[PDB]
From Swiss-Prot:
It holds the Pfam family Staphostatin_B. Specifically inhibits the cysteine protease staphopain B (SspB) by blocking the active site of the enzyme. Probably required to protect cytoplasmic proteins from being degraded by prematurely activated/folded prostaphopain B. Also involved in growth capacity, viability and bacterial morphology. Residues 97-101 are annotated as: Binds to staphopain B. Inactivated by staphylococcal serine protease (SspA). This is Staphostatin B. It comes from Staphylococcus aureus (strain MW2). One of its GO terms (molecular function) is cysteine-type endopeptidase inhibitor activity.
Length: 108
């Protein structure tokens, strides 16, 4: 059994450009990392969702999104695109020393 974390991105898509939506959409889905025995489910949630996250930046040049949990802005998640079946997720704290390596997640 793996641990499954939900990430519900909260945003009004009617206010985004098509390019912005395309870039967020690269990260939607069910993802897993074998070594960590961890899965993540990244979805477009809303105000009814638990596990809500606010997008800080959508980098359409580099296919990266940054986001944080609504009330815990000390931990920034950064997702990078690898291919249709792989994304990278980094969890970072401004207050820490060093780099947490991004972790490769494969699509389920």
């Amino acid at each position: 059994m793996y641990q499954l974390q939900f990430i519900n991105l909260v945003y009004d898509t009617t206010k985004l450009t098509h390019l912005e939506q395309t870039n967020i959409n690269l990260f939607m889905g069910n993802w897993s990392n074998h070594q960590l025995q961890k899965s993540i489910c990244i979805r477009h949630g809303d105000d009814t969702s638990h596990n809500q996250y606010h997008i800080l930046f959508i980098d359409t040049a580099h296919q990266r999104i940054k986001f944080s949990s609504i009330d815990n802005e000390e931990i920034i998640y950064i997702l990078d695109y690898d291919d249709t079946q792989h994304i990278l997720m980094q969890t970072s704290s401004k207050q820490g020393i060093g780099t947490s390596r991004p972790i490769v997640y494969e699509r389920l």
